[PDB]
Symmetry: D2
């Protein structure tokens, strides 16, 4: 029941099942996984592919010969399993050199190094077939007000993304960028903290068509925002290039629980939206198996990510297909929300006495919205109580 | 000491000092203020002007003759005092007809009424000299997932703002719009919940040059965001048309405390930014005197708004003018943040072996940022300990 | 399916289905309900009983003769329907006189009035058969630091509850008190803000056996706390006298959604705990039907409260009865958590070399907890996927 | 100006200035400090003493001979500098064996090991002169609902603290315990999450007089609570045995900023309370110098902790000594809050017609509280604007 297949397009980062369990108060509880073993085990679970930071695949500082060895072994595991690599990204946060950021470090030489490190991994991503290149600026930000002039930092961030766009254009690469927002952690405040801030920033880039967002469930919930609403705005703007799925219990540290944990009803409404809108990209899981777990629990937690997506997919589909729900949607006037307010135009609106002078406001105000009956139908469907 | 003058451009909404103290758990503690008395008392405190919702000035349902009487009395108080009206807005949230929103109500007839009510007040705002027209969509949103299709609602919101822009264009009015974001309250989630979401939405309007943001201190802090950072992004995009100042103690209900209360250090960094960037618009206070207060406390709380801005202005100016601070800013490389990362261009960067092949990452990583010394200088200046 | 009966002990406040929809930004959307009609309609839905504030039943300021008329009509509706009144409470928050609190108002004459108003309603509660008397100090608190000396205010709060205990003791009444915590709203910070603070305060009262807590789902979640955990501590201390059920979406204004909305998984774990622990008191709903709703939606939202409790009860029971779950609980060592750490005593522990000198820490650390498999079984049961 | 002396009783944990900068997303930015060097440098800054976890001083796994060497070197640095060790604590969170907790681990053998590890360090603390022994149960908690039965876990937590109390009693030690609450991180929810929950738990211990709380500024603010209010309740109960000072910017990960950063006004009201109440214990800083800093920034950040306390001490003292403030306090009736509500007793209250039958509620309600004028005097004093 609810078994994934590679046609479901489920993907996982190497750093997810490979997380050793080191947290700010404790040492690792699990040994390191060989990327090749992770590819094999994920393929057996029904995954479609994997993603990586440069430093997940090729340890930092590797020689060019060591680098080719790591890539060759990885490429062989992909050939043996049929797994794909749809997305790649750059680690610009672990090494101490990035302690004040990568693209927006105050030190100019660090910003130049950050760009060269990114460009080298874009070449590798293209070689392995990635369609999307993610940028998470986890160190771009500040703990104190005077440390970062944010207008100058946004100039530097625009400069870096513009240069990356010039690079992929000049090389003829068919790859697009997705910016991943996060409000805080590990910096006290991170630049571009939500989906909205990232979407607004993209419109000031030289080639905006090359850039979209990679929102993550838990990150928007770290600001107490409604994740399905933010995804809807990203889809409305045509900018949902990729998505990271996980779980989060409210406003606190980034928990990265398996998908379906955390806010379960928000997960239901997210799956409903993605499937209704026909989102075609990977269903990527950026999660951490809790450090309480051994390797058997790692694979159980990864399987649960996919299982929970498929259960919610079934329940949302049953909800939308239910004739009683379709009738409730009409009773709450969702059909009228989809019709233009004034297709007759401004002048007709101004001359329409039924829109103001003769509008019965008391009769309109007395109409109930019937939203609670609709939401209880949604509850019953989620819980399998119809 | 720290006495405001009308050249300081401090403004107040009629609904601020006029708040009767009704909250969700209690009845009013103060009687209603006549708008004329509020104008007179604010002028004596040193304010520059006032702002209004249509329904603050002209009670809902007034006849055309009653309406002219209310406006004439108001215009006379402005002439007698020298007060200005730089901003106006529409009440699309109090009346029960707006219980599911104004521009994005599911009912089409309500959306048409909302537009006609707004258009009528734009005419009045222009007559009284307002330069900015604010839109706060406080009822645009949902408490449950199925009640609002957010892509359709954004279509309806874009339709409404586009029609308003066509109206002001066709009338030849010199007025601009500012969208006021809020994450929640009174709806469970509100559409366009942060400055970032509003900025991104504006770029999809037909005439984006007519629209900017009106951020409010407490609203961004209701999502745990850094308000100075959000203001910096708005300034970077050229979209800070107006600003609402108040105080808020963290993530909870919208408190609307007087400016300077709440997060005091954030207030310091906000004033530093506005004065450094040369923001020219009104310093508007959207605050509520606590319902514990009588009318003497109302005026004391309004005076405190202005006093706290002027004290912080002095401390931020002393901070930036201090030679020891200028030297600390260079020590933390704020000068290098303002220089281009790669004015030499992409190809020069790619050929620069000092940017990657021969870059000493360990030497760069060992450089301290000196941010804590800089932040303690900022503390000492804020507290007057130098 | 899932139909409530009065043996399920579901109760509702008069102020819940009777909420007219007035919020801080909008006027009422529904007319007022006669308490008699609410009793009748709740009885038809399957409720067990109702609760009231004094001012819900007898309008503020009523004459003694008007008061007897209101009570007589109410008592007749109870006799006609079979409904019970298991809990009553005092309104010490709506009237302007209580704007700085009731029991901890700075004005001494207000504190004396608050006590007399409470005592008069305790007599009425006993007459109507209430077993529990709830105190929610919604105005006890402050918006600013100097306004309230909290040690003096706690002295005044202890004084008031001690006097109430002396009153019920002297009258021979069989009624107990339950303190309802809330962290904020309508005051900026409220005294006794969480279940823990209330439990600690009770232990300093003269007759602690007369006092317990009345926790509310949404209130603990307004501080980001785990509501099932707090309930477990209240049960562990023997102090869960009553409980208020509703829903809340994270850290924001008090939403009072119907039970099951908000954090659905927390609702599941709460029902599991209450049923496992054999909690015997009322399942009381303190919720507000959204102001979008007409009266048909009011009754639909009230029915949904009860439906969601009964569905979750079924799923939690199936979870605990599943042999595969019982085996998973043993695999995660929940059986060992219930055994004493050192029933052999301190000296035996100190002499036990297997507890320190010869303890294999690396072997113990390598044991996986198997919590993710257990939690996915819980998910599958909640969703009806087994 | 504002120079600390050891009579100010400022203390620091070895783990604070010794933090190497490892966070969940990045490697260490600073080398390790020798405890002896930290003692010397803190003594030169004006500190009174230091605190330690067992594993800060004696690396985990040390032989008995290595252990005596580490202690002897440490004792010599204390003799050379005059520094004191007023508090010690146990590391029950870093080693993987503690991944499901120490005192409340599901595995019984782990709970026994946790107790033996604690008991061994209590002996060392007494030898070095510590008066308080802190317990922070950072791993006691859960990420999922079924993993931890909280009633059983509280039984195990009570068992462990009772055994520790029996141990210190049997040894004749003059040391007391302080429980440190935290709401979350590194567990998803931590048991005893706030000061209130810890105070309530203590009252169920066998020898409650031996146990108090060690609240931390940032931890209560992680739940959005008012830290001065919580400290006032701890003082009211006689349980403030120790305190941890730092800074925190709202509800997010535990930032551990230097004291005075974060919520500055809350720091002002905290210092006012501690000095007014005559708190006599150490002013202990549990903070982390940001990983952006080199060792010069470490010592600058530690100095700033002490400087900010001394500046706030001066401003709070000036506030309370100002005759205009004393008059404002009387105007807001803080004097009446300190008087008994009903020293005349219950029967006199019941017979007092001025308390109910003849009480003018409208006249009392019309009295303004004058809190905004009082709070602006407090602002002016904090900022040095009088
Ligand atoms: Mg994350
Ligand atoms: Mg991610
Ligand atoms: Mg506001
Ligand atoms: Mg505003
Ligand atoms: Mg509530
Ligand atoms: Mg309640
Ligand atoms: Mg901390
Ligand atoms: Mg601490």
């Amino acid at each position: 029941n609810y078994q994934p297949t590679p046609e479901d397009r489920f993907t996982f980062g190497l750093w997810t099942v490979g997380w050793q369990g080191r947290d700010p108060f404790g040492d690792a509880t699990r040994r390191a996984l060989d990327p090749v073993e992770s590819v094999r085990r994920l393929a057996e679970l029904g995954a479609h592919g994997v993603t990586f930071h440069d430093d997940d695949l090729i340890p930092f500082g590797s020689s060019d010969s060591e680098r080719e060895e790591h890539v060759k072994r990885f490429r062989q595991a992909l050939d043996d399993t049929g797994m794909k690599v749809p997305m790649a990204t750059t680690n610009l946060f672990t090494h101490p050199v990035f302690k004040d950021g990568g693209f927006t470090a105050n030190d100019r030489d660090v910003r130049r190094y950050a760009l060269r490190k990114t460009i080298r991994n874009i070449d590798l991503a293209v070689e392995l077939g990635a369609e999307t290149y993610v940028a998470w600026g986890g160190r771009e930000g500040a703990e104190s007000g005077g440390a970062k002039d944010v207008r100058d930092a946004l100039d530097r961030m625009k400069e870096a993304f513009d240069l990356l766009g010039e690079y992929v254009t000049s090389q003829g690469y068919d790859i697009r960028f997705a910016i991943e927002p996060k409000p805080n952690e590990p910096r006290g405040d991170i630049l571009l903290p939500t989906v909205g801030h990232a979407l607004a920033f993209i419109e000031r880039l030289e080639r905006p068509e090359l850039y979209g967002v990679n929102p993550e469930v838990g990150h928007e919930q770290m600001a107490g925002l409604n994740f399905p609403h933010g995804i809807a705005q990203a889809l409305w703007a045509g900018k949902l290039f990729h998505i990271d799925l996980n779980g989060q219990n409210g406003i606190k540290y980034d928990q990265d629980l398996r998908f379906g944990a955390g806010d379960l009803r928000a997960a239901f409404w997210l799956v409903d939206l993605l499937e209704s809108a026909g989102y075609s990209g990977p269903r990527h899981f950026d999660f951490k198996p809790p450090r309480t777990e051994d390797f058997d629990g790692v694979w159980a937690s990864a399987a649960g990510c996919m299982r929970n997506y498929l259960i919610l997919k079934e329940r949302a589909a049953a909800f939308r297909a239910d004739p009683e729900v379709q009738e409730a949607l009409r009773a709450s006037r969702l059909d009228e929300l989809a019709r233009p307010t004034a297709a007759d135009g401004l002048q007709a609106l101004l001359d329409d006495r039924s829109a103001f002078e003769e509008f019965d406001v008391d009769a309109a105000a007395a109409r109930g919205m019937a939203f609670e009956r609709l939401d209880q139908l949604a509850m019953d469907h989620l819980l399998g109580a119809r």
